[PDB]
Design a binder for this molecule. Structure first.
Ligand SMILES: OC[C@H]1O[C@@H](O[C@H]2[C@H](O)[C@@H](O)[C@@H](O)O[C@@H]2CO)[C@H](O)[C@@H](O)[C@H]1O
Ligand SMILES: OC[C@H]1O[C@@H](O[C@H]2[C@H](O)[C@@H](O)[C@H](O)O[C@@H]2CO)[C@H](O)[C@@H](O)[C@H]1O
Ligand SMILES: *[C@@H]1O[C@H](CO)[C@@H](O)[C@H](O)[C@H]1NC(C)=O
Length: 398
């Protein structure tokens, strides 16, 4: 969509680059909301309304073709990100799901480089990524996410998409969702927006989940028909890693009886360990709280390989078939090596209550507990804060 007259005022966020020799050193980054979360309206004289809702192609009246859509649909800058629940303070990013006035912005943001015109590309195979988090205001059913997608570095800036990454264009993920614009272009044929996704963190105060999701396509692929489906180009389910799912119940939760006590802030470390020819072999998650390293649990479940790291053996044994078919750990690592964009969001699930995150095999949450209608009765204003985003040499971030 065509950028409007309203200014885009990106929140600034300080992050760090770390080495063993130099420690963690500060760097300036910026935060951008998803393009389609910006106000979208029509060109002068065309009346009120937008250019399509999530799940659909854009409307044919204004978007009969890409070229017309590019001129008839206007994407406004956001001059006050706090209106969308997004604020920063030094090295902290706060994402508010619900505002005091009852709006539910459910923000999704990407990390821009210091120029504001290219995403900060992270290349994490053989390195580690670490952050601090306050998860206290995330009950059952909430998903605070911090993850990587293989988006184009300028958001595919082009003739019909002059806005690019500066306006948050180019989103994709392993679900191949249909959005009315893809790569800043009207999605006239209603294709899905597919790409490799590494879910570093999907969590609330009750459960913590890690999952790589492979696709058999590089970068953003516009899928059609069965390509967008379960036996298509991307791994919808991922290879999930959650202590509950591997029969460890005392590792992560609200209270002193959990190794990681989500009533207080903590640090989350993720290492992407490569084999001697440079390909990803293992993904290792551990934590730090109150100045003490909390090593990963090991799996504790009959029929599940004994391990403290995500690898092909574990993924295959736990039924992650599409993960394996669409590239396995090596394929996930090849996407990581090519470069990925960092996305952070907070969201809830009206359909399915986020049961896969924190219910049943996945956590302590009861049936119905994660419904949005109940979430607001438990925590009226869910939010997450991510602090001191930092990445670099193995062993150097913590
Ligand atoms: O379900 C809608 C939300 O999707 C979130 O993205 C998911 C993504 O679809 C999935 O493949 C995986 O990579 O985990 C992501 C993080 O939970 C968005 O972040 C959120 O904004 C919603 O659109
Ligand atoms: O429900 C959408 C949700 O699915 C997750 O994958 C789940 C899957 O739903 C479930 O059948 C399986 O047993 O566990 C998986 C989690 O390990 C995806 O991970 C998530 O991204 C959503 O797409
Ligand atoms: C689950 O863990 C408990 C505690 O360690 C153990 O007693 C039990 O046998 C485990 N169950 C399975 C299916 O492995």
């Amino acid at each position: 969509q065509k950028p409007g007259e309203t200014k885009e005022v990106h929140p600034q966020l300080t992050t760090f680059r770390c080495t063993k020799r130099g420690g963690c050193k500060p760097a300036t980054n910026f935060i951008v909301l998803d393009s389609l979360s910006h106000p979208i309206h029509r060109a002068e004289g065309l009346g009120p309304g937008g250019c399509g809702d999530w799940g659909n192609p854009p409307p044919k009246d204004v978007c009969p073709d890409v070229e017309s859509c590019a001129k008839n649909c206007i994407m406004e800058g956001i001059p006050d990100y706090s209106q969308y629940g997004v604020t920063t303070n030094g090295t902290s990013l706060r994402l508010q799901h619900i505002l005091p006035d009852g709006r539910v912005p459910s923000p999704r943001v990407y990390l821009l480089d210091k120029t504001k015109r290219r995403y900060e590309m992270l290349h994490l195979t053989g390195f580690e990524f670490t952050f601090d988090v306050d998860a206290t205001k995330l009950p059952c059913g909430m998903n605070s996410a911090l993850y990587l997608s293989e988006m184009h570095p300028t958001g595919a800036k082009s003739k019909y998409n002059p806005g690019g990454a500066y306006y948050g264009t180019g989103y994709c993920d392993a679900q191949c969702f249909v959005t009315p614009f893809i790569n800043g272009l009207g999605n006239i044929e209603g294709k899905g927006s597919c790409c490799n996704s590494m879910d570093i963190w999907e969590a609330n105060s009750r459960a913590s989940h890690v999952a790589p999701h492979t696709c058999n396509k590089k970068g953003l692929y516009l899928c059609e028909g069965e390509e967008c489906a379960f036996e298509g180009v991307c791994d919808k389910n991922g290879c999930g890693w959650n202590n509950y799912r591997v029969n460890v119940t005392d590792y992560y939760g609200r209270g002193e009886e959990f190794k990681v006590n989500t009533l207080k802030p903590f640090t989350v470390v993720t290492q992407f360990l490569a084999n001697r020819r440079g390909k990803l072999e293992k993904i290792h998650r551990f934590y730090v709280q109150d100045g003490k390293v909390i090593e990963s649990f090991y799996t504790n479940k009959e029929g599940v390989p004994y391990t403290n790291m995500i690898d092909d053996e574990f993924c295959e044994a736990t039924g992650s078939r599409k993960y394996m078919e669409l590239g396995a750990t090596q394929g996930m690592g090849e996407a990581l090596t090519r470069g990925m964009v960092l996305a952070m969001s907070i969201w809830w699930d009206q359909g399915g209550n986020m049961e896969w995150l924190d219910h049943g095999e996945a956590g302590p949450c009861a049936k119905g507990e994660g419904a949005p209608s109940n979430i607001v009765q438990v925590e009226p204003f869910p939010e997450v804060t991510y602090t001191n985003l930092r990445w670099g040499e193995i062993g150097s971030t913590y």
